Amino acid sequence: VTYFSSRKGKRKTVKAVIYRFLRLHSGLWLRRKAGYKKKLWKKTAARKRRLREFVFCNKTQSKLLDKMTTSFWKRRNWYADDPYQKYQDRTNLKV
Amino acid sequence: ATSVSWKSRTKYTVMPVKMRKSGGRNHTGQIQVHGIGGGHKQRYRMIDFLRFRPEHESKPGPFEEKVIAVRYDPCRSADIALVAGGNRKRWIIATENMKAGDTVLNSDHIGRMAVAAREGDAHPLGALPVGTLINNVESEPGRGAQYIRAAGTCGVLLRKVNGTAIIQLPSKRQMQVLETCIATVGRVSNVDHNKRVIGKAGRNRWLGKRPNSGLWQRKGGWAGRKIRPLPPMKSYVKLP
Amino acid sequence: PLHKVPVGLWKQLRLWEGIYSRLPRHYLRSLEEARTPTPVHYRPHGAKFKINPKNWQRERVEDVPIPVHYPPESQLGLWGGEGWVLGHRYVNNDKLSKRVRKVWKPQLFQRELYSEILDKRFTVTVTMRTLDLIDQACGFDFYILKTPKEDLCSKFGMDLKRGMLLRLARQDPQLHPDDPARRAAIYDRYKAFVIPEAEAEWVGLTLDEAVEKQRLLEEKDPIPLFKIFVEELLGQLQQQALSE
Amino acid sequence: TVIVERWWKVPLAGEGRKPRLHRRHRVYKLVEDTKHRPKDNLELVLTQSVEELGVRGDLVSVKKSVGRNRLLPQGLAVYASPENKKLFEEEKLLRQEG
Amino acid sequence: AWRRDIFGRIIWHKFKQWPIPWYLNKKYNRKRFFAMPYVERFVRMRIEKQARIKARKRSLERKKEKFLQEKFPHL
RNA sequence: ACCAAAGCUAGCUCAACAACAAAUACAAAAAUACACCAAAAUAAAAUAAAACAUUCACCUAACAUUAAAGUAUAGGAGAUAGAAAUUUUUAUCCUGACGCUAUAGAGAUAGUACCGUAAGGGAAAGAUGAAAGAAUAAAAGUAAAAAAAAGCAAA
RNA sequence: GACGAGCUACCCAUGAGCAGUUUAAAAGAACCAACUCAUCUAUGUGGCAAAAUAGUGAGAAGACUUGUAGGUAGAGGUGAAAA
RNA sequence: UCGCACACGCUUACAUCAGUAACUAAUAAUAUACUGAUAAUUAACAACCAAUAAACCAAAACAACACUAAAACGUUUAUUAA
RNA sequence: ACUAUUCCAAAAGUUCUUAACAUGGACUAGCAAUUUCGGUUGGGGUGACC
Ligand SMILES: [Mg+2]
Ligand SMILES: [Mg+2]
Ligand SMILES: [Mg+2]
Ligand SMILES: [Mg+2]
Ligand SMILES: [Mg+2]
Ligand SMILES: [Mg+2]
Ligand SMILES: [Mg+2]
Ligand SMILES: [Mg+2]
Ligand SMILES: [Mg+2]
Ligand SMILES: [Mg+2]
Ligand SMILES: [Mg+2]
Ligand SMILES: [Mg+2]
Ligand SMILES: [Mg+2]
Ligand SMILES: [Mg+2]
Ligand SMILES: [Mg+2]
Ligand SMILES: [Mg+2]
Ligand SMILES: [Mg+2]
Ligand SMILES: [Mg+2]
Ligand SMILES: [Mg+2]
Ligand SMILES: [Mg+2]
Ligand SMILES: [Mg+2]
Ligand SMILES: [Mg+2]
Ligand SMILES: [Mg+2]
Ligand SMILES: [Mg+2]
Ligand SMILES: [Mg+2]
Ligand SMILES: [Mg+2]
Ligand SMILES: [Mg+2]
Ligand SMILES: [Mg+2]
C-alpha cells in the first residue's frame, strides 16, 4: 500500500485486491474459493459443489482488504441489472 | 598523454643516426609487447633494400658497385656491407663470403640464356638459373626486399610458369612472384649466429630482453605437438 | 529567494534583448516555429482514436516521436533526416529476459550528387533513405528546395539550399555563362521556388552565423566629434542668418 | 533505416503539453527493417536509345541499381515527373505528325 | 574589445602590439575566447549566488530602519 | 578567595515584490616573431521486491491551480507504477514574521588560519561606560580547613 | 565523475660514481673501503623513530647503485607472482 | 671528530642596535631560532641566449690498438643573420 | 558490449563475383557482465530428515 503518492500525494490502491474480491455496501467482502478450476476429475461431486460457491470473509480480512482500497470502491453503486444490488443492504441484524 | 616517434629522417645518410628505443610501449605509453627494454644503447644504420636503384635519374643502365667494408650491426642479426659507386654510398645486407675490396653487379635486365651469379650479384628472378640460392627477395616489383633478410638464411628458386617465378621461403612455404622482381644470389652473412651460446642471464639484459613473468599457468588446449599439412602457396600475382 | 522568470524562458528572453533585436523578423519567425519532423525510425498510426482489444472502448491515441541521435559527421552529409537510434532491448524479446543497452547505426554510402543550380558534382555520404527521397522528389535540387529544415538535419543541406536559393534570386549570369538557353531551362522549372533577395541570404544560417553577419552589417567606426560639432555650428549660423 | 517500437506504453498529454518520458520507455523491439525489404521499380523516361531497355522517347521500369548509377547521372533518362511527361506527349504527337 | 573568456565571464580584453597578424601568432591562437557547454551550468550558479548576496543585503537595510524607528519614537 | 559567571549586538533564516593604469593562459600576473586550430557517443547504482535476475516513483522537461482519479489502464498481473477526453481560477495593489540570538542562526568575523602533492576538507572566536581627549561572587576544580579502628557510605 | 607515478612498480631521455689489494683479466672471479642492501641478536614498544639505534652481517665493474626531467591511472596501471 | 662549497629545496629564520616580567628553547644562564626598530646579497661565475643546404663507415677505456654488449657529446665549406 | 570468426541480407557489378572501409540479423569461440549459494539440528560440518 502507498500511503502518499509521488505525483498527487494521495493514497494509492492495490489492484490485486480489486481483481479477486467484491465489496458490498454493508462492508462484507465476497470472494471465490481457492482451487475451483483445478483438477476436477479427482474430486467428488460434493467437493466440486463446495468449490463453485462464493463465500464471506472474517472481520480480520474485511478489515485488511479495506485498508488496501480507496474511497472509490466503498462507494454506493446502482447498476442497471445489478445482480448483487439485492445483497448490498443489511436487514434484521441485532448485534 | 602524448609521444613523438624517433623515426623522422627524410634523407639517406650512411653515417649512423642516433635512435631512441622504446621498451614495449605504444605511442600512448602503455605496455603493448612485454619483455623489452634496457638494452645496450645502439645507433641505427640505414639500409637500402632496393638493390637496383639507378643513381642519376637520366641514365637507365646497370650498376657496378664496390665493397669498401663489412661491419657488425646491433640492429639486425645479419652482417652489413658498405657499398659504393659513382657518388653514392649505401649499407646493404652482406652475402656470406663477401670480403672487403670486392665487386658487385646490379642489373634489372632479363636475358633468355640467364646468367651464372656470384653472391654479391643481384638479378631479376626470371634471369636466374632454376636451381639457384637466393635472399632479400622482393614481393611486388619496385617494392624493395622484404623476405629472407635474417642471419644465415636462404631461399631457393623452384620453377617458372608464365613469366612468373616460384620461390621457397625458409619456413618452406612457397611464394609466387612476377619475373621482374630483383633478388640477391647467396646466403646471408654470419651463418653461425644460430650456434652462439648466451652464457649468463647478463647477455639477455645486454641484448635488451627482460625476464619472463613469475605467473604460473596450466598449458591450454593450444599446447601439444600439432602436425599440420603445409600451408598453401602465397600468390602475389593478381588476375586481369 | 526565487527567479523573476523561469529558466526555460531565460533561453527565450535571451532573444528579446540586445543585438538579436536587430535581426530581421523573417529569420526569427522561421526559427521559432518548428514543424514536427517526418517520422523516420518510429512508425506513426494515422487515427486519433483507436479501439482497445481487451477493454472494447474507444481510446484517445497519441504519437510520441522516438529520440534519435545525430553524430557530428552526419551534420556534414545528407542522411535523409535519420541517425543513430540509442536504446535498450530485451534479449529474445521476452520481457522476462535480460535488458541490454543497444545502438542501431544507419548504413552509410559514398555517392556523388549533381546540381543544376549549383552546376557541380558533390561527393556526399548518403543513406539509402536519402537516395530514396532524392528519387521521389525527382531531382537533387528538387530534393533540397522541396524539403523543410527539420527534415534535412544537416548544416551542409541548409547551406546548399541557401547557396542555390541565392543563385536563383540573383538570376546569376555565371550559372551557364555561354548558354542563355540552358539558363532559361534550368531557371524556369525551379521558378516555383523563387524567394526575394533579402530573405535568401539569411535562410541557411545558424544563430552564431546570424549574430556574426549582423555584427558585420552593423559596423560603423564612431564619427569624429569634430564632424557633429561643425554640423551644429553651421545649423546655428544658418538659423541666425535666416532670422535676420 | 530501422523501424522501431516501444515495449512500454507511454502515458498521454493531449492539451499540447509534451509527453512525459521515463527510462522504461527506452526499451525497443525491432519491428521492421528497410534494407531487408524487396526493391521497387523506378519509372523513368528515356531521352535516347539504351541497348536492352528502350528506344528514344520511351517509358521504362528499371531497378534503382541500374537507374541511379547509370541513366540519371549520364543524362540518358529523366524522372517520371508529369511536367516531363508532357514533353513526350509533345515529342510523340510531333513524331507521327511529320 | 569585449570577450567571452574560458570561464564564461564577460571580460574587457586590452589589446597588445605584435609584429605579425593574429592568425600567424602562436600564443594568441591557443588563448581561447569562448565558452563550452558545461560552463553554462557554472554561469548560472554565480548569477544565483550573486542574487543571494544582493537579496540578503536588502533584508539587512530593512531591519535597520525598524529598530531605529522603535528605538526612537520620532516626530 | 581564585578559576569562572552574566549581558545584546554583529549578522543570519524563510517569503513577498521586482578607484584607475600596467600585468596577465612562459612555470597565470613576464611589452615584443611563423601559426594551426578545435572535438563529440542513453545517466548508472545504492535501494524496494523482506533473496534476487523482468520491473522500483523523485532525479529533464516544464507547467501551473480546483476536479475527472488514485479511475482507465501498465505490472515476475507481484512490489508498485498511472494518464487523458472534459471541467475550475478577478485586477493590481497591502508587506512581513506565534523565524534565530554568538555551541543558535549562514560554514562564515573566512572559504581565511590550518590539514592535503592534488581534486578536496575546513575551524575557532565578540561583550564596562554619555565620555577611558574620564579608571553577580551562584557549575565542576581548588583554596580557606590533611587524616584517626568498620566496610555501595547512607538511613 | 574528478584528482594522484615529487613515494613505490616498470620503462624513456639526459647526467654521474666505483679507491685500494689480487690476478694475463672489469671474469654477473677473489679480498676489503666509499656506496648499496637487511641476516642474526639485544635494546626500543605513547620510541630518538607511525619500522629506529648498537653490534653483527651479505653485495661491492655489475641483471650495480644514484641525480634531474618525462610517461602508463583504478572495470585500470605495473609485476625476476609476494594476489 | 659527517669539514668547507655547489646543485636541488627552503623563504628573512641571516646582519646591527635595543628589550626580555611573560610568550620560542622541551629547563636556566643569554639569543643563530623569542619582540621592536633599522639596515642587507653590487657580475667577469650562473640563467637567458640562430636558421637551412652539404661533405664526413671508422668508440670511450692515459688509447699505440683492440674487445663485444657496438658506444654520449661537431668541425668545416655555402646562403642569409637587426 | 568488445575482439576475432563463419553465414545471410544490404552495397556495387556481372551474367556467379567482393578491394578496403561498413550497417542489419544470426552462428562459434575467447576475453568478459549480473546474481545466489535452502532449513532443522543438544555449536557448526559430514550423516540423516523436510
Ligand atoms: Mg633488436
Ligand atoms: Mg621463457
Ligand atoms: Mg614459470
Ligand atoms: Mg488535461
Ligand atoms: Mg532487496
Ligand atoms: Mg527491510
Ligand atoms: Mg543479499
Ligand atoms: Mg533509478
Ligand atoms: Mg556560528
Ligand atoms: Mg600547502
Ligand atoms: Mg564551586
Ligand atoms: Mg559503621
Ligand atoms: Mg611523471
Ligand atoms: Mg618517477
Ligand atoms: Mg675496483
Ligand atoms: Mg665479483
Ligand atoms: Mg657486543
Ligand atoms: Mg663480503
Ligand atoms: Mg662471495
Ligand atoms: Mg623487480
Ligand atoms: Mg604463488
Ligand atoms: Mg596466497
Ligand atoms: Mg640555491
Ligand atoms: Mg622559556
Ligand atoms: Mg540490475
Ligand atoms: Mg546450507
Ligand atoms: Mg543453519
Ligand atoms: Mg551436531
Ligand SMILES: [Mg+2]
Ligand atoms: Mg551441546
Ligand SMILES: [Mg+2]
Ligand atoms: Mg548432508
